[PDB]
Design a protein around this nucleic acid. Structure first.
Ligand SMILES: [Mg+2]
Ligand SMILES: [Mg+2]
Ligand SMILES: [Mg+2]
Ligand SMILES: [Mg+2]
Ligand SMILES: [Mg+2]
Ligand SMILES: [Mg+2]
Ligand SMILES: [Mg+2]
Ligand SMILES: [Mg+2]
Ligand SMILES: [Mg+2]
Ligand SMILES: [Mg+2]
Ligand SMILES: [Mg+2]
Ligand SMILES: [Mg+2]
Ligand SMILES: [Mg+2]
Ligand SMILES: [Mg+2]
Ligand SMILES: [Mg+2]
Ligand SMILES: [Mg+2]
Ligand SMILES: [Mg+2]
Ligand SMILES: [Mg+2]
Ligand SMILES: [Mg+2]
Ligand SMILES: [Mg+2]
Ligand SMILES: [Mg+2]
Ligand SMILES: [Mg+2]
Ligand SMILES: [Mg+2]
Ligand SMILES: [Mg+2]
Ligand SMILES: [Mg+2]
Lengths: 70, 149
RNA sequence: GCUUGACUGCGAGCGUGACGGCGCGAGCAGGUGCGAAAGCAGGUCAUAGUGAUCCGGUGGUUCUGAAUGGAAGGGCCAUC
RNA sequence: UGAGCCUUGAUGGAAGUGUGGACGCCAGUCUGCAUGGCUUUAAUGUUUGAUGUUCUAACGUUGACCCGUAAUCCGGGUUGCGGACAGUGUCUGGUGGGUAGUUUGACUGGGGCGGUCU
RNA sequence: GUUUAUUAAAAACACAGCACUGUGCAAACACGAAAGUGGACGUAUACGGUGUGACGCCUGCCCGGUGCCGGAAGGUUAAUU
RNA sequence: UUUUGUAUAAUGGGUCAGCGACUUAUAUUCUGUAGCAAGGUUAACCGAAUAGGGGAGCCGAAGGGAAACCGAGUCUUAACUGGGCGUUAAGUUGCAGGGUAUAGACCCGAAACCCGGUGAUCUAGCCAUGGGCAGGUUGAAGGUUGGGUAACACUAACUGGAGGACCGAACCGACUAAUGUUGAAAAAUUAGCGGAUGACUUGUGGCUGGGGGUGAAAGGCCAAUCAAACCGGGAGAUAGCU
RNA sequence: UAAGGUGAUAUGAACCGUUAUAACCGGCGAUUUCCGAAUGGGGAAACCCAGUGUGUUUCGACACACUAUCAUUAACUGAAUCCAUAGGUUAAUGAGGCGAACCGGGGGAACUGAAACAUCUAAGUACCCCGAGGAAAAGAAAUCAACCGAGAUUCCCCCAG
């Protein structure tokens, strides 16, 4: 709903029947939530997927640091 | 993809291998519970260094002690004295604690370990081919001679 | 019987329309067919048989082509 | 279980006995055991897909406990059931008067109906 | 019994009864972007939706059309590669 | 005023007084007038501010062609002819006016749509907690006892007290007629009328919000408003109509 | 600064002032009940009720001060589990509410126009919401230009309807 790391959420867009309509739409992202820190205990968090990777890319732990200074 | 190891895992994944892994590399297994990976650019920078540096500590055992046979086999034989009576039967028996100390004074604190010695010899006076080894691939055949003081 | 004038490029001057537009047209240029030749032929005896624009499709052309050479795309001509 | 690889046996090396098997041009190979002198296809593996079966570890739990806490909420922990299922995001086909915006011509002895429209 | 407060009290709405249909419980269904709540602190002798409207004797033929229920072998067919 | 046409019995006005409708901005084009002239003129800005400075730039003295391109010519065509459009038309910048364009665009006026708030002190449902129902009837089930049966059915007195039960005040409701209709009253009064222990009736407070609620269903009710409430806004909506 | 004054309807009364300290004007300070973010709990705003302190006390007890939530840190504590977290207590700091336009950001109509209407228009406007400042925002080229070169952003005139 804000994705703890690489924060994202409900952007708005519109629809397109190609024929007629431009009804507004609305996005979101991805819910989901895992993580378990091998430096203490399994802290978890709700993050997007493309948000999980990134952390799991070269953070995973090297990233909690930003939430420190939330 | 592929990742390093920290264990053995059914698949070519011996301690220290970066190959044949599956998507979502654990993070729910092989990384958290048990071994791990987070390969990255910095984590291999050290681990990968293990290939080169380990080969050194592992090379020495095959460097200094490999052909080291001469320094204990350059002589045609070692010779110790004792006591006999019959056609040269040594009462007790002279062996490791003896051959060793002797050659040790010579320059070999050799231990009675990997020595092939099938029996505490010197029981019979004369020669006795006693091969000894310090390392796996290392070993040397050295004949010994029994004499009576 | 012989043929392809159901030609290509223009057009004096007219008729008819609010306009878009529509119609008639001798004569000129290039090449045709028919006739010995004068000459006739720019579709059918004439008057109905029709759809503007836009968006595009196809072929032709060095008209243009966003640094330049190309290209895409645009124009122009022919046509759906 | 297909397809690719590509590492091996089978289309262009002589025994004597018993007997197993596979293909076989049915003048007859190849190999098991007890005893002796590159083109076509089988399989180990490896990749990649198709379906299934099992598992744990993600994910769920509107089962049971402990703690925060002399809370029905929430969270964290122990355990059981389920399990890569379900569920969600993006994209996508079908449904969709539930809901929304609209359209539904003119002439005409009033309007309609009929008929008309170049 | 109810109804058009302020021109209609009725033959209309409701009713108990009947039938069809859906729902295995985190129920179907409804309110809600969600959390959550109602259904129900109920659990198929229960809850919902539709139609008929005590009771009596009954409720015939049609599945072509539309809708719904099952099948899903074969044809056609989206994103995707 | 509107009409072919109105004394018209078609429209508007009781009368008077005050107010009440072609404006404004920039752009474009004509007309008049003024300046200058193949040239006319500056914009922002600077500023010893209406000066002076600033000529970025806009318009005209050249046009033709779709254009490259050519040029008083040029397109057209293979054409050197003809035909189309041009070629000894002075423009330009102010000022005042006629018109147009963008704007609310002479003025007044919809029924409506959209956005955000206020409303369940009426009313409709529902929740919690309290209250009301004079009097007079009928007389279910159950039960006791007598008869009766092998035993149960069954029957008779009695007791018993049921019911969206019966007549009828309070209370609740509204079927009929008269009166009222600038009323006593924006739904009542008078005489009758229906229910009146029930799906009853009522006090207090609470909960549902507008495309939403509630609805024993009439599109009914949601504050004298309901086929989509009231208030404020988009707003001078739009009005080929009066 | 001064010959006059105690605001107005508002006089009357009782006073204050007059050749160096009334009144009046300006600066700084004192006091500033209660309600209201409202902040001790509560609450039909201006009121109901409480905990811990304090002095006086005619020693009865009363008037006053502090006690909101949240965050940064620190100190002390301390579960499920060894630790360790979680959670609790305290202290100091700061924040909360209110505002005219202008500014940045999240969300975002329809009327209307197209002489109907769905693309398109109105318009990113009206409106709602968050946030900051005297200004915001922007800003020092992975810019533009054409083979010459210019040189962050910003605003005005023009290119051009
Ligand atoms: Mg004819
Ligand atoms: Mg509709
Ligand atoms: Mg509309
Ligand atoms: Mg008509
Ligand atoms: Mg009745
Ligand atoms: Mg009525
Ligand atoms: Mg009535
Ligand atoms: Mg019926
Ligand atoms: Mg029937
Ligand atoms: Mg008339
Ligand atoms: Mg009159
Ligand atoms: Mg009239
Ligand atoms: Mg007057
Ligand atoms: Mg001419
Ligand atoms: Mg009754
Ligand atoms: Mg009466
Ligand atoms: Mg009665
Ligand atoms: Mg009430
Ligand atoms: Mg009303
Ligand atoms: Mg309004
Ligand atoms: Mg508007
Ligand atoms: Mg108006
Ligand atoms: Mg207080
Ligand atoms: Mg308070
Ligand atoms: Mg319109």
């Amino acid at each position: 709903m804000k994705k703890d790391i690489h924060p994202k959420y409900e952007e708005i867009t519109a629809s397109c029947s190609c024929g007629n309509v431009m009804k507004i739409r609305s996005t979101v992202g991805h819910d989901l939530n895992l993580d378990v820190c091998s430096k203490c205990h399994p802290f978890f968090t709700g993050k997007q997927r493309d948000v999980a990777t990134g952390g799991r890319v070269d953070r995973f732990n090297k990233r909690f640091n930003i939430p420190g200074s939330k | 993809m592929q990742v390093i190891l920290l264990d053995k895992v059914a698949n070519l994944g011996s301690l220290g291998d970066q190959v044949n892994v599956k998507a979502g590399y654990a993070r729910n297994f092989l990384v958290p519970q048990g071994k791990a990976v987070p390969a990255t650019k910095k984590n291999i920078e050290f681990f990968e260094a293990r290939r080169a540096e380990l080969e050194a500590k592992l090379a020495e055992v095959l460097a200094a002690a490999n052909a080291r046979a001469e320094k204990i086999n350059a002589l045609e034989t070692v010779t110790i004295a004792s006591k006999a009576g019959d056609e040269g039967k040594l009462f007790g028996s002279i062996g490791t604690r003896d051959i060793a100390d002797a050659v040790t004074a010579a320059g070999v604190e050799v231990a009675k370990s990997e020595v092939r010695l099938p029996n505490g010899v010197l029981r019979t006076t004369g020669e006795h081919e006693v091969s000894f080894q310090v390392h796996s691939e290392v070993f040397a055949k050295v004949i010994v001679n029994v004499v009576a003081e």
